[model samples]
Target: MNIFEMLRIDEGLRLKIYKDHEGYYTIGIGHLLTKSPSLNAAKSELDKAIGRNTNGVITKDEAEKLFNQDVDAAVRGILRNAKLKPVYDSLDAVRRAALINMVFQMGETGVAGFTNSLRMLQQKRWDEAAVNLAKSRWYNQHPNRAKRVITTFRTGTWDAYK
Candidate 1:
């Protein structure tokens, strides 16, 4: 599944994805916007926020201004969630994917708050990871999203483009 499919993006939803007067680049899963005009400009500014990257992935400084801290927090939070930690630690690729997705949705600070889940991951406990994931704020705020992610984590198969 691609980002757009995962987020169910459409023209109508795109309009609602951002607030009026705020300009942003619309990726499938989220938007990167700022006071800038173009994605390249945004990337130039992002280089400062994330530091230099040799990977050639476009770095948008504007995104850092808008999402850097939040993404970091969210990643940490998901890793630390008590119910998710064990499962996360047990599967390297899935755990990484989950962290990236969480960061994409919640931001850095939010991810960091998964204290108990982090412990579970450190211990490589799958059952506990599922339990922690189900109890997360993400679960409370976006039950469907949580279900999708959990399913992906468990099965290692997600329809990103569907």
Candidate 2:
């Protein structure tokens, strides 16, 4: 599966807006709408797309659109980073998705803080990278996801779904 498919499972999908773990107004596949400008714009756009004033409802198509946009943003964010770009280019699709997924969940700036892990990844030190990743608060907070992504980094395979 691709990044979109993988993330749909990782993030889960909902047609109605709800509060996320961080208490942000999130919808679709992890689309945060806590910010007034984003919330207002999304509401306005979705209302027209659905042909009515959808208080907090959305369609799969609309949701997928937002999800794609978010994923693209993450990809671009990774590519735009001086350190991450080369490391990102050196990996296969599965491994790339692992990094993209982390960036997708944690934003570029946050993920960039994993200096040792990124360096390990760059040096092709798969085990070391995973070890460094496991030491993070992210691992403590989301063990399952961190483990899966870490596995992908080490093995360059998408075996977690199986």
Candidate 3:
């Protein structure tokens, strides 16, 4: 299987914010807490890893590494959730990627508040999900981003998202 397919076979994609097992705020394919900073000591560590001075912000390389290592591990852990098994199994990558990014920006709990939208999506209720999502504050907060995800959830493709 392709890499993404391999990653999501059993565990459905999570595009909203939710809590980890320990109740820490986490979201996305990986469950890292939203806005949680683990790199306070990374000024030196990140510099060492990237062989460059980055004024304390992590380098692109380090962020990439974080996704593969930290994020992937977090995603694996979250996928173990039995309640989300159906979502993990049904969504394709484009639809999945949007949710992943959503959880990346907002915690899973944050996104879960969009119950109407999520409920529609779970039922394959396409248009209604988008209509419901449109009324949400999260949707109102990010029109462009919401468009991509909503359209994908509604239409089942990445065409409009691009």
Candidate 4:
């Protein structure tokens, strides 16, 4: 399966605003907005992200469109890091997708903090890469998803797809 398809499975759609695990306003496949409980600023941020006024509620199609845009942002964010290029290029599609999934959950800056994991990935040390990734607080925060992604890194296979 493709990365976009995998992302859909991992990040379920939400046409309306809801508080995330960290208590931030979030909607449409993990899109983060203001911390305020009011819908005014939240709607404004949603419109900004969608690039079109969503009015009150967005359709499933709109949510999917926003999700695609977010995925692009994540991919571009990863590419913007010069130090990650070599390792990113060295990975196969599955492993690369796993990295993209991590970046999707956490921002690029967050993922970049896994220096040893990235280094291990660069060396093609699959198990070591998984071990390094598993040691992070991110892994603790989202153990289930993290295990699936880490398994992808270790085996260079699409574990989540199955």
Candidate 5:
């Protein structure tokens, strides 16, 4: 099977938080989730890394670690899709981070809708891609976030980059 077909069949399949026979919130893909995840549960793991916290919650360091792990998954999602693979491998780390932000909000399925925009990105046509990127649904729904992507796309660097 091809990439698009594989994506539909294998991924984006949300098991969903539904009631089981015992009325427990449950959804599992490969392994059985014996314990629900939470900050407290991950406290030991978090403590082992960041060396910080938020009133038994999490601090910036902890959050950053989690964000890195989460975004890594999204980036993997972006690369797994055939259309995005070219652009994903071509861009630099900062630009890839911006694109990862896009996928975080839109997912592979949502970001995949930007046929022309992604095409331009694949071609490394920054200006054209930036304009098309702004036209996407995510742009309108999230102008603030989209602004960052558009700025970084048309231009090589954003404020923090340079």
Candidate 6:
């Protein structure tokens, strides 16, 4: 099954998915982090590292952790998809991962918000790509969350990573 199918999504879930992309960390009502493939995986890894589940809700502290984990997985999944993979592979894993998380959170079309950033990445302009990533409506909407992911892309460090 496709990712959507695997997730057993309905119209409400679809809207929630869009909301997630729009930067609301809370999952749809009745759904839990453990129910999403990407989120569930993130929670598993996060729990191992921090002994908790950062499911993008509850607190900024928790959302930051969940965002990082989900973004990493999102990048990996994007890389695995033939269409997105080529573009993704051209980037450093850290940058690609950051972008993927944004894409995942924002939905594929939402990445258009980073049109210039993506173009820069496509042209192999790493520094510019990073810069464009930071200067976005998305970043403005969620500075703390955006900062964490951008830091990952820029510094390539996992410390304070999630």
Best by lDDT: 2
Candidate 4: tens digits of C-alpha lDDT, residues 49-78: 778887646778877777888889888988
Question: Between the candidate structures 2 and 4, which one is better when assessed by TM-score?
Answer: 4
Worst-scoring 10-residue span by lDDT in model 2? 33-42
lDDT tens per residue, model 2, 1-162: 888888888889999977666566678898876544456666765576456788889888888888988999999999999878988998877899999999998888989899999989988999889999999899998888788889889998888865
How would you encode candidate 1's per-residue C-alpha lDDT over 1-162 as one tens digit per residue? 442344333111332223322345442125543455665655554454446541224334433333445445545665666654544465676446655676566555566577776666566665676688789767886676677776655455565223
Scored by Cα lDDT, where does model 4 land? 0.82
The lDDT for every candidate, in the order shown, is 0.52, 0.85, 0.53, 0.82, 0.56, 0.52
Provide TM-scores for the models.
0.49, 0.87, 0.59, 0.90, 0.58, 0.48
Number of the top TM-score candidate: 4
Error of 6 at 9 (Å): 24
The whole-model C-alpha lDDT of candidate 5 against the native structure comes to: 0.56
Cα lDDT of model 5 by residue, 30-112, tens digit: 11112335434444433444454423344344444444555567778988988777877888765776676667645688777
lDDT of 6 by residue, 24-83 (tens): 323432122343446545345445444645343334444445445554556666666555
User: What's the CA RMSD for each of the models?
Assistant: 8.9, 3.1, 9.0, 1.8, 12.2, 11.9
For model 5, the run of ten residues with the poorest summed lDDT: 25-34
Model 5 misplacement above 4 A: 1-62, 160-162
Judge candidate 5 at residue 134 and give its lDDT: 82
Question: Which has the better lDDT: candidate 1, or candidate 4?
Answer: 4
Give, for candidate 4, the lowest lDDT window spanning 10 residues: 54-63
**Superposition TM-score, candidate 6 onto the true structure:** 0.48
Query: Candidate 1: how large is its RMSD?
Result: 8.9
